[PDB]
Amino acid sequence: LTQEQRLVLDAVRRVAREVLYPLAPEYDRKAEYPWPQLKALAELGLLGMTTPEEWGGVGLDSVTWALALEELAAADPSVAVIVSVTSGLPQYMLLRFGSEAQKRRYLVPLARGEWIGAFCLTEPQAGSDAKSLRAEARRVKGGFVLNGVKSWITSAGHAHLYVVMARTEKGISAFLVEKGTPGLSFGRPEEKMGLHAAHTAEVRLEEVFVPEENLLGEEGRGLAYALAGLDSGRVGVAAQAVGIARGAFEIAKAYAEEREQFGKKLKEHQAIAFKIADMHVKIAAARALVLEAARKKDRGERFTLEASAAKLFASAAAVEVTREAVQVLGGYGYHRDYRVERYYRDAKVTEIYEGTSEIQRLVIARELYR
Amino acid sequence: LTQEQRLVLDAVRRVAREVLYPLAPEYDRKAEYPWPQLKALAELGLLGMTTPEEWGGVGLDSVTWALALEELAAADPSVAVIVSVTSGLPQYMLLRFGSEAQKRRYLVPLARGEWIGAFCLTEPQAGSDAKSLRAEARRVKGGFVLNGVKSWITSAGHAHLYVVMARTEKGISAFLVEKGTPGLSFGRPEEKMGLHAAHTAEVRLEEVFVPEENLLGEEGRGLAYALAGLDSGRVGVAAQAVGIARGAFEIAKAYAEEREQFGKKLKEHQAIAFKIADMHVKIAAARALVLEAARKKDRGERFTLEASAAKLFASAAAVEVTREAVQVLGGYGYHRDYRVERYYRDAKVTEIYEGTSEIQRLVIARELYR
Ligand SMILES: Cc1cc2nc3c(=O)[nH]c(=O)nc-3n(C[C@H](O)[C@H](O)[C@H](O)COP(=O)(O)OP(=O)(O)OC[C@H]3O[C@@H](n4cnc5c(N)ncnc54)[C@H](O)[C@@H]3O)c2cc1C
Ligand SMILES: Cc1cc2nc3c(=O)[nH]c(=O)nc-3n(C[C@H](O)[C@H](O)[C@H](O)COP(=O)(O)OP(=O)(O)OC[C@H]3O[C@@H](n4cnc5c(N)ncnc54)[C@H](O)[C@@H]3O)c2cc1C
C-alpha cells in the first residue's frame, strides 16, 4: 500500500476502533439503528468513498475502499452494511446515470452523508428473480404514480432517499422517492438472526406521485443500471465478509494465547493451532480475491466474474472462520460478552444478500462459458 | 503483465503446449525420464529461471517464475517437478552461499540446463524432522568422507550434481557431489502413485570422498542454508499445484460443453455448472495466494507465512479440483486416455512433499505468533 492509501486506512481504523467497536454490543442487543456511528463516519466523508470529490465524496480507489469496508465490518457489520448500501447502488446509479440536477441535489447530500440512501428491488415474491418484479409505475400527467411493496430494504424508514425499481409500459425503471412523500409507507423492522442494528423493513408505496424529474435515466433500462452496480456491490460485500472473519479471528488468536487448559496455552495443542492457521489461510485467500477484483475494477475492465468469485468465497470463508472462532473460546465463544458469537450470526447472511451463493454460481458459470 | 513478462510466458506456453503436453501421456505410461522435454526447456534457459544472467540463468521475477511453473505443470506435472527441483535448492544454495569458483563450476552448468541437479536431505527415518538426519561426514585427509542413505531423491541417478546434507562434528553441512564419484550409487526408481516420469530413488554414499573445495558454506550451517530456499520452494510447489488444477479444470470445462446426457450438454445441468464454477474459484484463490507470496519475495521481505499458506491452500485445491474434474467426465474421467485421472494421482503428492500440510500449519501457526 502507498503512503496515501495507508493514511486513509489510518483514519478508518481510528473511527472504527473508537466509535464503532465500543458501541457495537449495545446497538446489537438493542437492535438500535446506528445514528452516532454513521454521523461519526459522515464527518470523515466515509459515507461517500465511492463518489468523486466533485460530488461530495472522497473518491477513493477500489483497493482502499475495499479495505475500509473490511475495517468497518470488523468493528460493526451492521454499520458496514448500511454504509455499503447508502454509498452503494444509490450513489452508483446517480453518478453514472443521473442528470446534473439530480447529482447536484441527491448525490451530494448522500456522498457527504447528510442523507442515508436506500435501494428497493426485492419483493415478497421476487428476490433472486428481480427481472420479474411486479411493482407498477403508470404515466400520470406530470410524472408517475407508483404502487407496490418492496421487502428487505436496508435502512427503510431511516433513509431520506429511496431508489425504487418499478415497472412501466416500457419496462423496469428506476425512481427517486424522498421520505415524507404522500403514499410512501414503511413496515416494522424485521427481527432477524443478525445485523440487528441494520434495520430492514418493507417500503410500501400506495399511489405515490413521482415528478418527471425524479425518474432516473432511461425508462425501461433500470434493471440494467442495477446489475451494473451489482459487480461493485459484491466486491463490497465480499470485503465485509472478510472483515467479519477478521474480527472474529483476532479474538480467537488472542484467546488461544491467553487461555490455558491441560497445562498449556490453547495454541500449544495442535488441534487449536491448526484451526488458527486454517482461519488465517481462508482470510488471506478471501482478501486476495477481493483486492484482485478491486484492482480490475480500477482498470476499467469487466469484472463480473471476479466479483462473484470474491463474494462467494469470502462469504463462505466468513461462515467457516466464525464457526471455528467460537469453537476456540469454548463455552465463552457462545457468550455475548465475547463477540465471536455475534460474528457467527452475521457471517451467515453474507451468503444470502447481494446475490445468494447459488446465484453467484450461476453468474460465475455463465461468465466462464461466455 | 508487462510486455517483457508476456514474452517469457508466451515462450513457456509454446514449449509446454508443443513439447510437454504431446509427450506427457507416453512418458507417464512408461514411467520414462523426460530428457527430451528437459532438453527443450534447457535450450530456452527455463532450467535456470531462478538464477541471474551473470550466472547462466534468465533471472525472471518471482511472478513470471510462478506463472511459468504453473504453465509447465498444467502440461506435465512430472516435468514441472524436475524443473522446480533442479532449479530449486541446488541453485538457490549455490547462488547465495557458494564461492566464486563453485558458482562458476556448478551454478552455470545447472542454470544453462546442461546439468540436472538434486537435493538430498530426506532419509529412511528422517523426513519432516530434518535435524535428526544420520548422513555422516567425517573430516579426512584434505577433504571429507561421507556415509549414509538419502531417500525419495528427485532425479536420483540422472542428476549430475547432488547437494548432500550430512553431519560433521560441527553439525549438518552442505556437500556438492558429482555423479561418477566412487562410493556413490543409486537405487531403482520408487514405484509411486503418480509423477511417474519424475524418477525418485535412493542415493547411497559408501565411503565417498569429497575434496575440501566441495563444501558449501560454513560447516555445520548446512541445515540453515537449506531451510532458506524452502520458502521459495514452497511458492514453486504451490504454483505447480495450481497448474495441476488448471490442467484438470480445462479438460472438464471443455467436456461439459461437448458431452450431452438427458438431452442437454452437461454444463446445462446446474450441479455440473456449479462444480465448474467451484473449481474456478479455488483455482483463482490459489493463484492469487501464490502471486501475493511471489511479489513479497521480490520485495525482499520475509514471506515464510505467505509461502506456507500458498502451498497448503493450492495443494488442497488441486486435490479438490481434480476429484471433481474426474467426476465431470463420469466413467471416462477414470480412463487413462482422458488425462484427468493422471492429474488426480499427481495432485495428492503436493500435500506431502516440500513440507506436508501438517507441517505447513505448524509453520503458519508459529509465524502467526512470532
Ligand atoms: C439483511 C438483508 C438485507 C437486504 N437488503 C436489501 C436491500 O437493501 N434492497 C433490496 O432490494 N433487497 C435486499 N435484501 C433482499 C435480498 O436481495 C434477497 O433476499 C435476494 O436477492 C433474493 O433472496 P430471496 O429472499 O428472494 O430468496 P429466493 O430468491 O426465493 O431464493 C430462495 C432459495 O432458492 C435459491 N434459488 C433461487 N433461484 C435459484 C435458481 N435459479 N437456481 C438455484 N437456486 C436458486 C436461492 O439461492 C435461495 O437458496 C436484503 C436481504 C437481507 C437478508
Ligand atoms: C514425489 C516425492 C519427491 C520427493 N523428493 C525429495 C527430494 O528431492 N529430496 C528430499 O530430501 N526429499 C524428497 N522427498 C521426501 C519428502 O521431502 C518427505 O517425504 C517429507 O519431507 C517428510 O515426509 P516423510 O515421508 O518423512 O513422513 P513423516 O515425516 O514420517 O510424516 C508422516 C506423517 O506424520 C506427520 N507429521 C510428522 N511430524 C509431525 C508433527 N510434528 N506433528 C504433526 N504431524 C506430523 C506428517 O505430516 C505425515 O502426515 C520427496 C517425496 C516425494 C513423495
UniProtKB/TrEMBL annotation, chains A, B:
Q: Which Gene3D superfamilies match?
A: Acyl-CoA dehydrogenase/oxidase, N-terminal domain (1.10.540.10), Butyryl-CoA Dehydrogenase, subunit A, domain 2 (2.40.110.10), Butyryl-CoA Dehydrogenase, subunit A, domain 3 (1.20.140.10)
Per the similarity annotation, which family is this? Belongs to the acyl-CoA dehydrogenase family.
Residues holding FAD: F119, L121, T122, S128, T154, Q270, T356, E358
The cofactors named for this UniProt entry are: FAD
The record places domain Acyl-CoA oxidase/dehydrogenase middle at 118-208
The UniProt record lists the Acyl-CoA dehydrogenase/oxidase N-terminal domain at: 2-114
Question: What does the UniProt keyword field contain?
Answer: FAD, Flavoprotein, Nucleotide-binding, Oxidoreductase
The Acyl-CoA dehydrogenase/oxidase C-terminal domain is annotated at 220-368
InterPro entries given for it? Acyl-CoA_DH_CS, Acyl-CoA_Oxase/DH_mid-dom, Acyl-CoA_Oxase/DH_mid-dom_sf, AcylCo_DH-like_C, AcylCo_DH/oxidase_C, AcylCoA_DH/ox_N, AcylCoA_DH/ox_N_sf, AcylCoA_DH/oxidase_NM_dom_sf
Query: A Gene Ontology molecular-function term?
Result: acyl-CoA dehydrogenase activity
- The name of this protein is Acyl-CoA dehydrogenase
